């Protein structure tokens, strides 16, 4: 269910374009990380996609969420089973 490159980019555009609007602006202003609920400086939060871009995931308010480096990273490498033990360890 992988997508093409002119798509994996076709969205990473709607990303930077969303990443630059009131919604995302204030969102990072607050500093609250979606996953662990902790507060961080607006810079230490990343735009993370629930359903990946390379799986048909769109870049919208209904699929993109603020995440800190920490949570956002573990999400990438931890195993789908490990990701839970981590969020459930918080």
Query: In which residue are the tokens 């799986």 written?
Result: 55
The reply to whether 3 sits in an annotated binding site is no
Query: In which residue are the tokens 């009131």 written?
Result: 22
With a CB cutoff of 8 Å and minimum separation 6, the contacts of 17 are none
Smallest separation, CB 80 to its own copies (Å): 9
The reply to whether 83 sits in an annotated binding site is no
Q: In Å, how far from its chain's centre is CA 79?
A: 17
Q: Give SS3 for 19.
A: coil
24 binds Zn ion (CB under 5 A): no
| Candidate list 18, 31, 34, 65; residue touching Mg ion; CB under 5 A | 31
Residues engaged in binding Zn ion (CB under 5 A): 33, 35-36, 68, 71
Contacting positions for Mg ion (CB under 5 A): 31, 76
| Positions at the binding site for Zn(2+) | 33, 36, 68, 71
């Amino acid at each position: 269910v992988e997508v093409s490159e002119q798509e994996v980019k076709r969205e990473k555009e709607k990303a930077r374009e969303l990443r630059r609007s009131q919604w995302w602006k204030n969102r990072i202003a607050r500093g609250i990380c979606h996953y662990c609920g902790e507060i961080f400086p607006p810079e230490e939060l990343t735009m993370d996609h629930l359903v990946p871009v390379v799986r048909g995931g769109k870049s919208t308010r209904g699929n993109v969420v603020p995440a800190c480096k920490e949570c956002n990273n573990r999400k990438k490498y931890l195993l789908p089973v490990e990701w839970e033990e981590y969020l459930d360890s918080l």
